[PDB]
Amino acid sequence: EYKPRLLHISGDKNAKVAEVPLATSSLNSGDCFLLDAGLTIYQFNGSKSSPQEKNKAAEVARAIDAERKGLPKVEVFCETDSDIPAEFWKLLGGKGAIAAKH
Ligand SMILES: [Ca+2]
Ligand code: NA
């Protein structure tokens, strides 16, 4: 399905993924998120996220890609990156300040 959804990867060393409301306000600097927009999957790594969380997010993205027979494009970026795509923020309802924690 190409209806955008936001997945939240948390747990620090014990990474878990779960859908959360699709909004910028659902994000936080300590975790990882996958904004699944259908043809494009955006992976946002919180600046304080853990290696296990990054790996989990990547694993979920590959699984989604596999189910979709490789059609989606996957973009990965760190929270502090200077070239995060504008579409990521647009789909989240607009760029804004991220909570330090969930
Ligand atoms: Ca692909
Ligand atoms: Na975390």
Domain CATH for 82: 3.40.20.10
Domain range for 101 is 1-102
The C-alpha angle 41, 62, 64, rounded to 5 degrees, equals: 65
* Number of the ligand closest to the Cα of 51: 2
Q: What's the resolution in A?
A: 1.8
> First-to-last CA distance in the chain?
27
CA–CA dist 53, 69 (Å, integer)? 24
Alpha helices by DSSP H, 13-78: 51-67
Q: With contact defined as beta carbons under 8 Å apart, do 52 and 13 qualify?
A: yes
Query: Is 10 annotated to bind ligand?
Result: yes
Give the distance (Å) from ligand 1 centre to CA of residue 87: 18
Say which residue the tokens 């955008």 belong to.
4
* Number of the ligand closest to the Cα of 30: 2
Query: Is 65 annotated to bind ligand?
Result: no
Query: Structural domain tally of the chain?
Result: 1
β-partners of residue 19 are: 7
* Number of the ligand closest to the Cα of 13: 2
Specify the experimental method: X-ray
